[PDB]
Paper text:
[name], a TAM receptor, regulates macrophage efferocytosis and polarization, and its inhibition holds potential for tumor growth suppression and immune modulation. Additionally, [name] plays a prominent role in regulating efferocytosis, the process by which macrophages engulf and clear apoptotic cells. [name] is activated upon binding to its ligands, Protein S or growth arrest-specific 6 (GAS6), which recognize phosphatidylserine (PtdSer) exposed on the surface of apoptotic cell debris. In this study, we present a novel strategy for designing [name]-selective inhibitors by modulating the conformational dynamics of its αC helix.
Author numbering:
A (entry chain B): 580 to 622, 631 to 659, 666 to 744, 763 to 863
B (entry chain A): 580 to 596, 599 to 621, 632 to 661, 665 to 742, 763 to 863
């Protein structure tokens, strides 16, 4: 999965955190052509066994990992997506000079894309643990792919808040919240509630409120993702068919 | 985007072929701006998508003017005393025009054009007439892409009428060659009618006399026979930016 550092050219920073940075880049490929890539520098064992596991995944709704470079500090190489992240994209759509006003059907498709990507990952028993709109990338064909920047109390399941166990249902809970971000076009979860009040708020039985123009059927699906008992929440494959059927029931 | 005709005063001709004239544009803040006015609902269509663009390397649109004189539409652009890049390059080879352009400045010229093209490529907008003559020099010597030619058309676009963003990349390679050659017409010794045959037999523009091998590599990649093998504007922009940083100041 390793790529020779020679074939990589680094550009300007695209985003910066504290556990690493992400920079644009040029990747020289096998067929001579160059490809625009993103380079997340995570400035190791659990990583080597991970990038190998992820470089073998292949799904259109899962971000594709092009490989890893070794500098003497590892760097992850991913294809550059001009459209950015779904969260920032949603906010832009509420503005006159950005993406056109995203209709209901396009928003639902966004959710379908994510559910497909998560179904694929949960089928291989992979735990994302950081699902959110900010971690979803828009491909060049406007299809959304699941990713994880890695460089969120309101996106964490109730059982994961008190205990520290994470499961496929924890990801499903975060999926419901992501579904709510999309339906709200970028709103922060639980307006009027502080991060420290989140566990108390959830333990008393409170959940995210139904968006303004969100269909009842759509809210039913996302609400199911927040059932107090993880075993009562539906699987990603179940969620994928529910969303796909709802989207089909809507006019083109 | 329309602007009251009474706010525009036309001057002398800056170049013809429609015609472009200098002009004074009274602004909303009371002051007048030195503008360029080009005269010929398909003309308004080109400018429809123009007022949306906002990039320092893309010529900015000031407005559109409909003259009912006797319609006659007119586009208003900011006036650039330094003219077009192609003519500017020729002037550089004369002792009364701008001084000899160093390699770094020539590279920055390409970098500016690449940023402009990258901006419009991300917007899925095809230029289709990219050349040094269609590039304008701003007051701060930065280059901006504009549009006022058989040798600037990609080989896939000569046979068919197909025009992709890779075709713009092909024309970008030719433009890079123009800047490196400081105004030489592409393909010396080759006629316009011989261009398609010339390209079909694997021949490409020749490497300039004082063109660094790295630079020629980048522009050669723009002329690959398969459009899918030509790099994108974003990749090209980084390649030029990296080449420029490696050279001393
Ligand atoms: C106009 N504009 C466009 C972009 C822009 O374009 C981009 N193109 C590509 N990447 C970009 O940033 C990414 C970098 C790395 C990763 N991901 C990894 O490094 C991962 C390693 N693993 C193992 N996984 C994983 C985990 C779990 C799974 F289930 C599946 C995979 C990873 O996701 C994802 C995105 C950007 C940005 C970008 C960069 C910074 C901030 C923002 N806001 C956007 C900025 N501005
Ligand atoms: C000392 N001296 C200075 C100048 C001089 O100064 C100037 N200042 C400003 N403009 C000038 O001429 C222009 C007129 C129109 C346009 N362009 C449009 O009207 C466009 C419509 N569209 C849709 N687009 C488009 C397309 C695709 C995109 F991606 C983006 C935009 C246009 O660009 C561009 C230049 C001149 C000249 C000038 C004028 C004529 C000939 C020459 N040789 C120079 C002469 N002598």
């Amino acid at each position: 999965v390793v790529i020779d550092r020679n074939l990589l050219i680094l550009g300007k920073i695209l985003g910066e955190g504290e556990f690493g940075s992400v920079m644009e880049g040029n990747l020289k490929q096998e067929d001579g052509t160059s490809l625009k890539v993103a380079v997340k520098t995570m400035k190791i064992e659990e990583f080597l066994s991970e990038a190998a596991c992820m470089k073998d995944f292949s799904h259109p709704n899962v971000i594709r990992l092009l490989g890893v470079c070794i500098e003497m500090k590892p760097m992850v190489i991913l294809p550059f997506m001009k459209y950015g992240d779904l969260h920032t994209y949603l906010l832009y759509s509420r503005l006159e000079t950005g993406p056109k006003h995203i209709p209901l059907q396009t928003l639902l498709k966004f959710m379908v894309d994510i559910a497909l990507g998560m179904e694929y990952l949960s089928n291989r028993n992979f735990l994302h643990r950081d699902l959110a709109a900010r971690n979803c990338m828009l491909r060049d064909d406007m299809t959304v792919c699941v990713a994880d920047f890695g460089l969120p109390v309101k996106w964490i399941a109730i059982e994961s808040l008190a205990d520290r166990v994470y499961t496929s249902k924890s990801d499903v809970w975060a999926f419901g919240v992501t579904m709510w971000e999309i339906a709200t076009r970028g709103m922060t979860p639980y307006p009027g509630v502080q991060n420290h009040e989140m566990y108390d708020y959830l333990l008393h039985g409170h959940r995210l409120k139904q968006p303004e123009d969100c269909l009842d059927e759509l809210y039913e699906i996302m609400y199911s993702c927040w059932r107090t008992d993880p075993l009562d929440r539906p699987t990603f494959s179940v969620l994928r068919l529910q969303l796909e059927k709802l989207l089909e029931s809507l006019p083109d």
